[PDB]
Amino acid sequence: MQDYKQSLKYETFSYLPPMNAERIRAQIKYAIAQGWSPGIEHVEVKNSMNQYWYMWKLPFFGEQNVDNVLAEIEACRSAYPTHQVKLVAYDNYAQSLGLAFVVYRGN
Amino acid sequence: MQDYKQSLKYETFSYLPPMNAERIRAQIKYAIAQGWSPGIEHVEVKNSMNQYWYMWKLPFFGEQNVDNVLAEIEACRSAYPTHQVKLVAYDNYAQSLGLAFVVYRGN
Amino acid sequence: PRLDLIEQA
Amino acid sequence: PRLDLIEQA
Amino acid sequence: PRLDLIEQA
Amino acid sequence: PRLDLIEQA
Amino acid sequence: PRLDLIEQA
Amino acid sequence: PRLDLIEQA
Amino acid sequence: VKKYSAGVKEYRQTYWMPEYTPLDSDILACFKITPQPGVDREEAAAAVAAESSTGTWTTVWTDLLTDMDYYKGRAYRIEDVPGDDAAFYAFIAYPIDLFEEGSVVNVFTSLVGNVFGFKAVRGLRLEDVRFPLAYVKTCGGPPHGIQVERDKMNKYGRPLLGCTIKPKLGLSAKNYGRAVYECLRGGLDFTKDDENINSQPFMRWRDRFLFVQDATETAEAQTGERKGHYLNVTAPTPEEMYKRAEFAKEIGAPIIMHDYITGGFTANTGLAKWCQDNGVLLHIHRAMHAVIDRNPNHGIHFRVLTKILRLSGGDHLHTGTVVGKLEGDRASTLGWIDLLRESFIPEDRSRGIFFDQDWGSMPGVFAVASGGIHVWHMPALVNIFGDDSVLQFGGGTLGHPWGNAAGAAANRVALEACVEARNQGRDIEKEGKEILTAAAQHSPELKIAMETWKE
Amino acid sequence: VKKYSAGVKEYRQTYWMPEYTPLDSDILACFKITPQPGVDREEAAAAVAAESSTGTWTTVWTDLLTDMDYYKGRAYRIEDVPGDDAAFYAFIAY
Amino acid sequence: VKKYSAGVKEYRQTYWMPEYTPLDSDILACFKITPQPGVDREEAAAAVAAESSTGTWTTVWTDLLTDMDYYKGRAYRIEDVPGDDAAFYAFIAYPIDLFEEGSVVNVFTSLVGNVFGFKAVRGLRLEDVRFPLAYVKTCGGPPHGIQVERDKMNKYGRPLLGCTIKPKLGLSAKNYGRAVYECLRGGLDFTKDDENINSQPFMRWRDRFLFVQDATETAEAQTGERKGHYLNVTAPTPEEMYKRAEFAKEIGAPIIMHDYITGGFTANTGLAKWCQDNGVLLHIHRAMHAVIDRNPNHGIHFRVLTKILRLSGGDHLHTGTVVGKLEGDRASTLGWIDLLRESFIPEDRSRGIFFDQDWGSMPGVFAVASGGIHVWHMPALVNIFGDDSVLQFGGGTLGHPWGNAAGAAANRVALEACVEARNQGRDIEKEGKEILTAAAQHSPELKIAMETWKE
Amino acid sequence: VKKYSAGVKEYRQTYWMPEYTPLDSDILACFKITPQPGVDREEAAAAVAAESSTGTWTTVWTDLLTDMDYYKGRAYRIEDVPGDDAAFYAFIAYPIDLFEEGSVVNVFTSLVGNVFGFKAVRGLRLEDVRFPLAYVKTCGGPPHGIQVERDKMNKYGRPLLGCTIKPKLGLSAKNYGRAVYECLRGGLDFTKDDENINSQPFMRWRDRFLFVQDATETAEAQTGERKGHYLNVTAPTPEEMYKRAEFAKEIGAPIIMHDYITGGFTANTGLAKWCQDNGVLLHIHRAMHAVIDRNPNHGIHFRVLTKILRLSGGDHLHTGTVVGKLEGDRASTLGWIDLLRESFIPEDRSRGIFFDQDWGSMPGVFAVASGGIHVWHMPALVNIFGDDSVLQFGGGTLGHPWGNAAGAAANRVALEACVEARNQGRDIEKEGKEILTAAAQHSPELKIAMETWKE
């Protein structure tokens, strides 16, 4: 028997190994393929469980270029280097997020 | 698109650039011109949202000299150099403040 | 405001 | 989902 | 009574 | 009345 | 009825 | 306690 | 009359009292009557007086059971309409005993119930109503009023800034909160539900209130300024309306909103009393006003609707924007803003004020400006409305090229620069461009905002 | 529309759907519009449709969070008023 | 008929209308009739139509007091059953006026009340019911639905993960909470009471709710993810059921569960309305479905029971696992999952969908999979159900060799790896083993989980 | 087992206890298992025992926290099915501690929750359940029972007579009352709402209750006999159900009716407790029974549903008519009628009674016969059911050529003549025609009734 080590998690994909650039890129590409609008959110680590994180600029409505999304992620990270950063994909047909996952964990 | 930077605010005029001596003087003069009684309040920064800040002495009922008001502001600042300091103008006809604005932000 | 311009005044 | 495949569409 | 001797009258 | 002149009729 | 055919009887 | 010494046991 | 004689009689014989002096307790009404050719002025005035109060188309014996001289409404003065010979002003006095105390409903129903349907008149316009102080004291009025609201929100020295979330419909609760969060963190005092936002399949009310309150609290912590969002409690039934108001109080929402005409006076008055009992600020939207108030020949002037709102109860009232209005209607608008906020409004025909209106101690109401307004309107808005106003920039905030936070900051900087310039004694409307341009040198947000929309 | 472009836009581009067939579930309204000379019928009808339903005087980004094609009210038919050339009937589906 | 003639009459003369075109408001039912040799199809169809609606075994004069042509149910189409010559499909239209609005009870009672007892038929199977939009709008439906639930729980991008605590019976409240705590802290979104867990001597409900809520809150703090446990409020009486639901709300439990067939439709509908009024998510268990839904010749197809649940109200519905089902029944299962979640389901006989079913704005329901499923099933489960599903691993979690926390983590890793692979465009069912094996290299928990149970 | 070893294990090792002697407190269940070839009997029995109680598909460590030997359900006897070699009877004992006291819901959910879905069995039929006296005492039972009901209604010496108003749907409230009035004045003790009659647009419930109560009181005054009408309180929600029950009590209605399967056990149990607290008789309709009870290989035998109804609560239970049933099913029917009415029913396999059922003091329930029955059935009905029964003639009353009053009188005369002949010692079924013919000589109503329908 191994003892299970308790640690904080970050929802979808957080139980997998941290994502390299390729894995992150595949998820954004999938989101665009679904017709979802990528967006970026960020928040102080202690406020991670708040319903409303800070929104970085506006959702990238109609964005088709994954590189633009990745550049925005870097720009958000530079502006708020201690914050967790989350990629979201807005599904306007369901008015829900098609996917959301933390790209940077903060602090 | 520029990202909007969130910071704490201080109500009326706090979205404008910090006031020099001339701008502050104009507001006090306007308050006296209205017949309002200038007063000074101060509080610890963390208690800024309390309904009841400390009152510096008493409202300067019937004060017509803006310089006396400015001198009182300095005297309050000296006594409580870490506190935020707020100028208020009592309107006894409406039993409300005709104007209020933070002159020093604290800490 | 309020009491400044009352009917009495 | 939801509105994507409505009767109207 | 009542309305007979009002202020108006 | 009522049921005599329904949409179905 | 009722008590006539009880388990006890 | 409790279940150790039940009627069934 | 002492004896009963059946049959139809002329209204003039009883309801036209040219020599009547109104009592202080009387409710007075000014109607602009555009009568059909052939009908006599006095008879038209008397007919309006009779049908709005105690009159009947035919003589009834039951009149003799009571004292019609005491109870009846009476037309007491006829005046020409300046520049309009087809119409005349009729002044009618109503004894205070005719009305349920504390009921804007009852007074409103009596004055506008059926006189507007007369075939004798081409048009009937209720211009003004003098509510006597004795009646005013029976009404609840605004739950808080301008001064109490400023103390509760700790806001002084400037107009408040608001934003309606856009699009009016279609956003989920979480996205709605995101928009609210961004606006509030950027420097707006308030955000609001659209008038059409109640509880819809795309966004149920309870989910909206939860996310909005989370957004409001987060922005308040991050700015150090008090924030609010007018949660719309307009609902199908009073039970539903109160349920939503109670939930807003339970989660700590400082302010709620209601549509007083479409929701109705009965619901609004109850909500206003509830708001006073529970310490919740009440913002009032005036949906449907244009249906009733636009036509200058037929309907009810907004000034009357303004008086009813102040009596019924609201801490804020949407008043439109005078920037669009022409100078002829500008003075009228300034007239009802005084009615909304002042304690005593003297009679002034140039401003459409037909009667002295004494409010006594009844608190004033925040005037709210909104519409297609943006940073360029700020100087004129600050000039016209003054400090005890709420300026709401829905499109002017969510339509900023850099998003809600930048748009809010742009509006906030523009407002503060206009206020500072006004306090320094500059003529802000004349120097508006120069003031805004100077402020923009320190605010990139305001600078691009001024480029987005035209001067 | 898929991208956010700020600024004022004409109501006709979105709220005038002459080829729309109302669904059975739709609420339909008939307004008799007496427009001010100079304003186009379709634009007047679209403006009534937009303001009564989901429209705004200026473009808002929040429209993109939802599906305006589903939710929006739409003017779908314009008709003359018999014997009155100053007015027209606008038929709007909600 | 206009005159009263007593005596027994054939059902065909009145209830068989081959030329009837159903109205949009009509409720339509498809019955698979397996009749006894000697009985005519049309007469069998008419007899089902008459007895389910307004008919009687003998002529009654009271029929003449009303208009039977308007009210009567009518069989309007007969069709062969593909590959089964002993049975035929009868299509019956019921006027909407026959049913209490907003009552799945009433509609259900009318359709299944006594036709199933006919000696004329060997078997009667209700295959499908077309609920018109007009009727659908009268029903409360799911208190929240998929999108609102995801917003409330802040869960996006994947199926949710659940676990039923095992053993089904026998654990004390504190031990029950320990099991819940371990599962939740290890990465499950939800845990649930077993369907049999109500209030037993070994574990009274109030003690269970207290310890479970403590467990839920502790796990939520330690993981930074929202957690829930479906507290079973199924109770002997409605008063008891509401008492338990109120206590769950009082202690902050986000979700509760109910058995809608065994508890009953009346209780479930009331609970669903209560849940909407109080913001509590409602998970629905389908105990007894197999009694009614298994037999292909006699009973009610689960697709009908699915439609009733969506109308009655639930945020989640147990749907079984398609992995066990054969391909013939796989398409049928995919059919009712669409009925559970979609807005408009077009008619598709290959999937058992006999009528177009329009739900309009009525929210969709989470499909819930459970049974003897474990990590190896994950790829197929993610493929079949998709994101808007809850996968519940009771034995697959508490049966892990290293305990609940490791078992939860193993399931969570397996789920996330399958989702990531699906998003990358891999065929997860074809590559399931490779995906799971790759993930196991980084998760000892998943690795030994894959060794515990077979592929 | 004392140590935790993960992995799948055979159910037989734990849940098959051939040497177990059931305790008196145990709930016992008899399932008729039709297993798929290849599966072992004991394993099938053990699997049913495990899944209905405490078992899991895989070993869980949490079992070791408790004492599975005490709590587990256990299969203890296997028996052949006489004349059917494909099936066997499994006898399973459940410790009383497994169930919520006073909850037919909980016991029912546990026994029928998921065992019916096993792929191991082709069919599963729950034949009988032994409810121990200790459990029986925790249940409310019938609110009044046969003897109290006879005392309340002052009815002795004969079966009661009822009628369902026809057509089932379509009549206005006033016309409904007219039909009720005519039936009651003609000699029926009771009339009833159809099972489908709840609250419909053609007849809202409150209007129905008012007119029916007026009809009942008028008929009672005109006959000098107590009368009642079973007002259907089956409703969408418990709140609605109780509202209707309260109104029936308020207007003085002596009896109400409920659909216990479609309405649901939770609603029924609450209604039964309410009925006892308020002195209202409760008639129970068994809609949906045929869905569950018809198939001899899969489902639940009605005798089990009968026991649940008696525990849940009802003063009357619809039992169908034995006249249609064949002799093989006649003895089974007589079996559950004894279960419904008797205090102690000894085990009798010929009648389908697998266990001794002791009811103790729990009151008996009126057996209700209905269907396409008419005067000619009277002799057999009186013979089979006896005095403590309600015979309901819906079509047999409203289908009389001379209307409801004559039809009621015809049925009443036929019933009384059969009862008088039985008391005189004649074999009423053998001499039925002669008895009816003799009575008809004094009753024109009965005479033409006997001509309307065939012998």
Describe the structure.
This is part of a larger assembly, with 2 copies of chain A (107 residues), 6 copies of chain C (9 residues) and 4 copies of chain I. With 107 residues, chain A is α+β, with helices and mostly antiparallel strands. Chain A contains 2 helices and 4 strands. Chain A is globular. Chain A starts with 20 loop residues before the first helix and ends with a strand. With 9 residues, chain C is largely without helices or strands. In chain I, strand 6, helix 8 and strand 7 form a beta-alpha-beta unit. At the A-I interface, strand 2 of A face helix 7 and helix 8 of I. It is classed as lyase.
Features:
part of a larger assembly; 12 chains; A: 107 residues; Ribulose 1,5 Bisphosphate Carboxylase/Oxygenase; four-stranded antiparallel β-sheet; 4 strands; I: alpha/beta; Alpha-Beta Plaits; TIM Barrel; five-stranded mixed β-sheet; 15 strands; lyase; TIM-barrel; complex
CATH class of the largest domain in chain I: Alpha Beta
Number of continuous helical runs of chain A? 2
What oligomeric assembly is this protein in? part of a larger assembly
Query: Which percent range fits the helix content of chain I?
Result: 40-55%
CATH topology (fold) name of the largest domain in chain I: TIM Barrel
Radius of gyration of chain A: 14 Å
N- and C-termini, Cα separation of chain A: 33 Å
- Percentage of helical residues of chain A? 25-40%
Strand content of chain A: 15-25%
- Coarse morphology of chain I: elongated
How many structural domains in the coordinates of chain A? 1
Identify the biggest protein-protein contact and residues per side: K-L, 103 and 103 residues
Output the structural class of chain I.
alpha/beta
Structural class by sheet pairing and helices of chain A:
alpha+beta
Number of helices of chain I: 19
Active site (chains I, K, L): 166, 285
GO molecular function, one term (chains I, K, L): ribulose-bisphosphate carboxylase activity
GO biological process, one term (chains I, K, L): reductive pentose-phosphate cycle
Cofactor (chains I, K, L): Mg(2+)
